[PDB]
Design a protein around this nucleic acid. Structure first.
Ligand SMILES: [Mn+2]
Ligand SMILES: [Mn+2]
Ligand SMILES: [Mn+2]
Ligand SMILES: [Mn+2]
Ligand SMILES: [Mn+2]
Ligand SMILES: [Mn+2]
Ligand SMILES: [Mn+2]
Ligand SMILES: [Mn+2]
Ligand SMILES: [Mn+2]
Ligand SMILES: [Mn+2]
Ligand SMILES: [Mn+2]
Ligand SMILES: [Mn+2]
Ligand SMILES: [Mn+2]
Ligand SMILES: [Mn+2]
Ligand SMILES: [Mn+2]
Ligand SMILES: [Mn+2]
Lengths: 140, 140, 140, 140, 140, 140, 140, 140
DNA sequence: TTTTTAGCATAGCTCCAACTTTTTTTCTGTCACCTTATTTATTAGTAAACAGGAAACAACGTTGCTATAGACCCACT
DNA sequence: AGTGGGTCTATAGCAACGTTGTTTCCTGTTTACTAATAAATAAGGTGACAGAAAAAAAGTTGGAGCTATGCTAAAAA
């Protein structure tokens, strides 16, 4: 279920940023009611991905830490790839969050390879910008 | 709703391939029960995208034809882009069907620009293949 | 066989009007049992005029499309010719359907030439109406 | 049944031409086996249109004479109408025999009126010939 | 030759009664073998009184029609004259057939005049019957 | 056979006129070759109507005499009847000789009765002559 | 103030054990009302030893981490030193918590040196136990 | 309350040294205002540990004498124990005064046993000094 | 003259209780999807009434083909 | 002048035969019909999935005592 991965990624990022994850912050980040957050936390505890205390909080496990690190790496590489082409920053996060769950790992590897190819040379990026402008002249 | 676009694309492709769309073929293509197909057909008829006859069939409208053509163009360009990098053909259709609904049109334009950039030159594709192999040596 | 041409014309007209031909509609149009319609469809499929699918339907071919277009042109020109003289509309369709199969193409060309001759001038049609009334005074 | 009228017309014409109708002559004229001719003769005798003697021959009745005269008048007026336009004499008889049974009497009256209209003036026929040539220039 | 006139009269009467003359009917009427009938038909054809077709039949000519009409008139007036006096009907036809060939036309005119004289008045016929009875009393 | 009666009548009349019958006279009277006369004489001798001697001649018998007398009476009454009406004397003998063999005895009795009726009164003959002239005015 | 060091040590130990410090747990550990805990947390935040969020929680700083590590080392070495001599475990924690704040660092170094001296040899500990028993015989 | 024991010990030591305890001397020794000294004296008089006269002075009781003797013995043994290890004399009195109230009597017995163990042999003290120097080489 | 108490006056410190955000726990309704049942267009035989041709057959109509008579000639008695 | 023995065709059964008109089969050939068969439609049941609404705790805050020093003298050896 993509929701499980989304929650794991959000919890891992929030822990790495703040040092501690809270239910209200997770609910605000995912724009969902805290009751759904509690249900998801209990379900993840049933899956032994994290340890939950009834009124204290949550602590991620080693497997959860690895999954969160991998998901954060995928998210950041997707963001970098989308920014490379020249997409507006407003929709970049929305598109990445929408597509980060339906993509296969082979596609992620291919995207990373493309990013590496376009990062070692700037002339390729300049040519991409030039052809993009010359083809978007119709939108002008 | 992405389901509406998915149904419109499937109906348009089936009409262009066979010359006529049938409920059983749509249900088999989308792997859903024919009752759901009937419900979706009635809902789309409520949206004036196609004309439905109680026991005869469906006929697409001009607006429906344009939407289907645009969606088919997006789908085929996504397939070509995914095939360009070198992803396995088995997962290409699944990934395209999963991501064809959550992507913005600007991202589609950027993907088309990248495909055009990589299509005018084969040396770039050869260098991409070489760097892909040199970086996937770790998987060997 | 005139029945083959009649079926081809009916199928072509029904496809051009509705966008799809169904067995029940053809049977109702030709006032024959659907079993005879199925037999005729199979026989026409044996003649490679159309492609038939066991439970889906029928799709006309390019040769079938040309034959249907020619037959529809002949039918409409016959209807126009019969309406020009002043025959009652009730029997026009019956007479056209009865005589559309036993006429030669040269006769069709002559009828079209006569229609063109009487269409470029209205005084000729007025004189025809006047002489028709003056000769049908005996029926009064 | 058109076959009854066809047989009555043929018998009436043969009697008026030769003075006596024979089974072999009727069979040759209608290009059918004499057994079918005998069956038709017996059926017409059942309809009291003519008197048949077992080995002697056939004699038409007053009603049969009137029907034959009317049918011969229709046939000859159809032949004259077809010859007026300029159709080749080879197909004139075939077309007249094919269409003499499916036409209504009102259409026959209209054809006779048209023949009368085109017979009182020769300038109309000359103009028809001129426009026919000018439009058949494409066939040249 | 009286046989020629007899055959012409029989053929004319048979044509006027049946509408067509056949060899078997003529042979039965004249109580002669059909071979003699064929010989007589060929001889009459040599005299250009009628047209004969090898297996079809015979058709009388205008001269033959006039001769037959005159002979039938003579025969019927002879029958009426013989019936007027009161001869038995059984021998009337035999006597008329026996004497219709040896009589001159002036005698025929005189017989017709006598018939006209006895037809305008019935008292003369009544007196003839009375004197016939009074003189045939010896036969009683 | 009428020839037998004709020969008997001729022989009886010749015997009553000359007193003796000769072969040459009979042949001249009947306009036939003497060989046929000899054959007929031998045949009649076979019928025991007359006695013939090889080179002498013929003598009639009592039965032959009665038959000849009856035939002569019939011939003379026929001649008188034909002369009564007013037929030309030239054709009277020819007609009587032609019709004296095909008539029945009852017809002879009726003719004799008519002759007796017209002989007792001359006013009837005068009226017959008057009506004959008034009806033969058309021949004038 | 010894209270500041006590709170820092408790927070550091609780964070190292649970991964996150909560106000209720600190209050229970120090057996004080949560209002005093909030006051102490605010005062420590004023001293820039930790970062406090109004309703989220507390996170220690690098200086706070070093101070907590040093205090935990002192506490554990005091516990080990007290256990070495043979004091009852019930009062060991109470005595260590009572004396961990009034001792100088030089005294801590001397205690650690004594622990190291008595840890490298077990005969010294055995002699200490023997003399302890021989002198505590008076308590028996 | 440790303050009661501290005051009793100070009063006992001052009486044993000077022969008489005065309020000013006690206040100077404990570095507190004489008002607090008067309050403490009144409170101790309420506890029947000493007899106080309104302007004369204080006299200890037998129970007070025993408590003071025991506390002085504990203080002197603590001083000797701290001096044995080699702590600087400047902080020895401060540390002893700080820790003389929070220690249990069993700990005091253990400290006395350790002092007796290290007093019967000087080689142990020499080895302690040697290991102390060898481990404090890092401070050099 | 100093020392020795007796209030006088501020102080954070700690606690109690009220207050005000935050976390869980059922409670309550909802669209999603599966399953079932019903209804109706689509085929595949399935049998029966014919239409017409083939073939066979039963009169009809015809061409010699010769038997028997009625003129016609010629020679003979 | 009257008779007998070859010729000359005319007329008439008759005798196949060859056709013409009738009858009887066959033989596809088309037309209602009747299951059966899949395809299309409508009706029900669970069932996750949020709101939402208490409740239950947690975290905050505003105050009220409570000692703990620091003044400032008034009294006593
Ligand atoms: Mn993400
Ligand atoms: Mn996401
Ligand atoms: Mn698609
Ligand atoms: Mn899709
Ligand atoms: Mn049509
Ligand atoms: Mn038609
Ligand atoms: Mn016709
Ligand atoms: Mn016809
Ligand atoms: Mn007659
Ligand atoms: Mn006759
Ligand atoms: Mn006579
Ligand atoms: Mn005679
Ligand atoms: Mn501690
Ligand atoms: Mn502590
Ligand atoms: Mn002390
Ligand atoms: Mn102390």
């Amino acid at each position: 279920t993509p929701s499980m991965e989304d929650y794991i990624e959000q919890i891992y990022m929030l822990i790495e940023e703040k040092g501690y994850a809270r239910v209200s912050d997770i609910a605000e980040a995912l724009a969902v009611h805290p009751s759904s957050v509690t249900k998801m936390v209990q379900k993840l505890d049933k899956d032994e991905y994290l340890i939950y205390e009834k009124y204290r909080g949550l602590v991620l496990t080693s497997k959860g830490k690895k999954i969160g690190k991998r998901l954060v790496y995928r998210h950041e590489l997707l963001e970098q790839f989308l920014r490379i082409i020249g997409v507006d920053e407003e929709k970049i996060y929305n598109d990445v969050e929408g597509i980060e769950h339906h993509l296969s790992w082979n596609s992620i590897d291919r995207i990373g390879d493309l990013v590496q190819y376009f990062e070692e040379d700037d002339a390729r990026k300049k040519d991409l910008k030039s052809i993009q402008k010359k083809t978007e002249h119709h939108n002008q």
